[PDB]
Amino acid sequence: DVSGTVCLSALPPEATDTLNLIASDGPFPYSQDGVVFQNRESVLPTQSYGYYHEYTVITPGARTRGTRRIITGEATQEDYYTGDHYATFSLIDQTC
């Protein structure tokens, strides 16, 4: 299940950076940014393989990718944020 919607402005500023890189098709800070996200646990709506892709949202100071991501869906304006390492997601509203 999706945990509601969230305004882009309410997310860390790195989320806005990630969306800007998605808008330019990168290049990204990691070569695996842009792989398919399988939605293997079915938290997001069921779609065929390749509908979803995942991208890092950088955590300040982290040596690793941390726990923050944007998952794109193929539909227009469809993007999900997780701040808890894929446990939960919110739909991102870029209009606010």
Describe this structure in words.
The structure is a monomer. The protein is α+β, with helices and mostly antiparallel strands and 96 residues long. 11% of the residues lie in helices and 24% in strands. The protein has one helix spanning 13-23, and strands spanning 5-7, 36-37, 52-56, 69-73, 79-82, 90-93. Strands 1-6-5-4-3-2 form a six-stranded mixed sheet, with helices on one face. It is classed as hydrolase. Keywords: Ribonuclease Sa, hydrolase.
Summarize the structure.
It is classed as hydrolase. The protein is of the alpha+beta class.
Keywords for this structure?
monomer; 96 residues; alpha+beta; six-stranded mixed beta sheet; 6 strands; 11% helix; lyase activity; secreted
Q: How are the secondary structure elements laid out?
A:
Layout: E1 5-7, H1 13-23, E2 36-37, E3 52-56, E4 69-73, E5 79-82, E6 90-93
Parallel strand pairs: 1-6
Antiparallel strand pairs: 2-3, 3-4, 4-5, 5-6
Active site: 54 (proton acceptor), 85 (proton donor)
Catalytic activity: [RNA] containing guanosine + H2O = an [RNA fragment]-3'-guanosine-3'-phosphate + a 5'-hydroxy-ribonucleotide-3'-[RNA fragment]
Family: Belongs to the ribonuclease N1/T1 family.
| End-to-end CA span | 22 Å
Cα-atom radius of gyration:
12 Å
Structural class of the helices, strands and pairings?
A: alpha+beta
| Form type | globular
Strand order of the largest sheet: 1-6-5-4-3-2
Number of helices: 1
